[PDB]
Amino acid sequence: QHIIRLESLQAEIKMLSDRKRELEHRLSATLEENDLLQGTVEELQDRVL
Amino acid sequence: NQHIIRLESLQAEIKMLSDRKRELEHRLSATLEENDLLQGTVEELQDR
């Protein structure tokens, strides 16, 4: 029954690690997209000057 | 007994890597907030 308990807990912790990677990939993607938007905003700063 | 101790050790390692991923997520959120603060001050300058 402990084997059953381990099968019920290991998969949940693995899917939680996958969800942590989901937040990592999406926030890292928004950071890279924000850095690209920072480059375009720096071009807008060039437009400002 | 042997395989249960091994699998609990594996579950603890996945929890350790999960806490490391949590720290990485918090750091990425801090960088997002600080860069967005820079973008907000830039938009204020744009209003000027």
Curated annotation (Swiss-Prot), chain A:
Q: Where in the cell is it found?
A: Cytoplasm, Cytoskeleton; Cytoplasm, Cytoskeleton, Microtubule organizing center, Centrosome
State the tissue distribution: Highly expressed during early embryonic development. Predominantly expressed in kidney, undifferentiated neural tissue and developing eye.
Subunit structure, per the record? Part of a tripartite complex with dynein and dynactin, acts an adapter linking the dynein motor complex and dynactin. Interacts with KIF1C. Interacts with RAB6A and RAB6B; interaction is specific to Rab6.
Q: Which family does it belong to?
A: Belongs to the BICDR family.
What the protein does comes down to: Acts as an adapter protein linking the dynein motor complex to various cargos and converts dynein from a non-processive to a highly processive motor in the presence of dynactin. Facilitates the interaction between dynein and dynactin and activates dynein processivity (the ability to move along a microtubule for a long distance without falling off the track). Predominantly recruits 2 dyneins, which increases both the force and speed of the microtubule motor. Component of secretory vesicle machinery in developing neurons that acts as a regulator of neurite outgrowth.
- Name under which the protein is recorded: BICD family-like cargo adapter 1
Upper lineage is:
Eukaryota, Metazoa, Chordata, Craniata, Vertebrata
Gene behind this protein: Bicdl1
Swiss-Prot record, chain B:
Q: Which gene encodes it?
A: Bicdl1
Question: What function is annotated for this protein?
Answer: Acts as an adapter protein linking the dynein motor complex to various cargos and converts dynein from a non-processive to a highly processive motor in the presence of dynactin. Facilitates the interaction between dynein and dynactin and activates dynein processivity (the ability to move along a microtubule for a long distance without falling off the track). Predominantly recruits 2 dyneins, which increases both the force and speed of the microtubule motor. Component of secretory vesicle machinery in developing neurons that acts as a regulator of neurite outgrowth.
Species per Swiss-Prot/TrEMBL record: Mus musculus (Mouse)
Which domain of life does the UniProt lineage start with? Eukaryota
Span within the entire protein? 245 to 292 of 577
Q: Which family does it belong to?
A: Belongs to the BICDR family.
Q: How does it assemble?
A: Part of a tripartite complex with dynein and dynactin, acts an adapter linking the dynein motor complex and dynactin. Interacts with KIF1C. Interacts with RAB6A and RAB6B; interaction is specific to Rab6.
Q: What is this protein called?
A: BICD family-like cargo adapter 1
Q: In which tissues is it expressed?
A: Highly expressed during early embryonic development. Predominantly expressed in kidney, undifferentiated neural tissue and developing eye.
Intracellular or extracellular location(s): Cytoplasm, Cytoskeleton; Cytoplasm, Cytoskeleton, Microtubule organizing center, Centrosome
